[PDB]
Structures are given as structure tokens and as C-alpha cells.
Design a protein around this ligand. Structure first.
Ligand SMILES: CCCCCCCCCCCCCCCC(=O)O
Ligand SMILES: CCCCCCCCCCCCCCCC(=O)O
Length: 129
């Protein structure tokens, strides 16, 4: 239904280093990645989502159907089995490895909040293309 469809680039983020260290991202990628303004491409067709996250040379492709089991490839390379849900047209919610992820679209701005214990990793992206 394409509410989420589009290309978005990171503008700013909070707690990137603390989060990525916690989840087990190699430090050399943490250091090279902290100032990258990554691009996220989303194609939504009803309940069916495809998204590509590009940060440098690194490209992660994922897909899921809302309300069904999916297999998501995380930043470490670990693939996790989970379910992604919509809470209204503009909010995607999921959990994996004790991390709660909330992706919310407001016009042209996507806010993604990933919470692991006390660590709240927040990314703000802006529609490009
Ligand atoms: C070899 C160059 C280094 C590349 C490593 C850069 C990795 C940066 C990580 C930023 C991507 C974080 C995306 C979190 C998932 C999400 O918010 O939807
Ligand atoms: C790399 C781990 C995948 C992230 C898990 C959340 C999956 C549901 C949301 C998919 C839309 C992705 C939006 C990206 C926004 C952003 O780059 O911060």
C-alpha cells in the first residue's frame, strides 16, 4: 500500500557506538560506520515489505510479510526469526535478541528506535530520491 515506500538517508543518530558494541559489531566497522549517512530503500506492497540498507560498501537486503514469521539479517550478519507488525499505516514494530525496534514514518521523516536494555539507539532519516 506503499505508505513506507521510498529512499531515505540518515540525517542524525544517537547512541550508535554504545549500541553496536553491545550487539557485537566489530570495532573497525563501528569506527568506520559511526559517521556514515546510510541510505534505506523501502518497497511496501500491502503487507509485503522489502528493504535495502546501504552503509558504505556494506549492503543488507531484507524482506518480511506483516504478521508472519520472517528472517531478518541484522548488522552483525546474524539472521533472526521474528514477526514484524504494523501499528497503523506508519509504524513498524518488532523484537529480536531482546532489542525492540520501532520504525515510524512521519511525512518524509523516518524515526527508528532500537532499545536494548537502557541503550536507546535512535536514527532519523529524510526522504531523498
Ligand atoms: C566497510 C565500511 C564500513 C561499513 C559499516 C557501516 C555500518 C553502519 C551501521 C549503520 C546501520 C544501522 C541500521 C540499523 C537498522 C535500522 O535502523 O533499521
Ligand atoms: C538490520 C536489522 C533490520 C532492522 C529491523 C527492523 C525491520 C523493520 C523495519 C524495516 C524498515 C527499515 C527502515 C530503515 C530506517 C533506518 O535506516 O533507520
Amino acid at each position: 500500500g506503499s505508505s513506507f515506500s521510498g529512499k531515505y538517508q540518515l540525517q542524525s543518530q544517537e547512541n550508535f557506538e554504545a549500541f553496536m558494541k553491545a550487539i557485537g559489531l566489530p570495532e573497525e566497522l563501528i569506527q568506520k560506520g559511526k559517521d556514515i549517512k546510510g541510505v534505506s530503500e523501502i518497497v511496501q506492497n500491502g503487507k509485503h515489505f522489502k528493504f535495502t540498507i546501504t552503509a558504505g560498501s556494506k549492503v543488507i537486503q531484507n524482506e518480511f510479510t506483516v504478521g508472519e514469521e520472517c528472517e531478518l539479517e541484522t548488522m552483525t550478519g546474524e539472521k533472526v526469526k521474528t514477526v514484524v507488525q504494523l501499528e497503523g499505516d506508519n509504524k513498524l514494530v518488532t523484537t529480536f535478541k531482546n532489542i525492540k525496534s520501532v520504525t515510524e514514518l512521519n511525512g518524509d521523516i523516518i524515526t527508528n528506535t532500537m532499545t536494548l536494555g537502557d541503550i536507546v539507539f535512535k536514527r532519523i532519516s529524510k526522504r531523498i530520491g
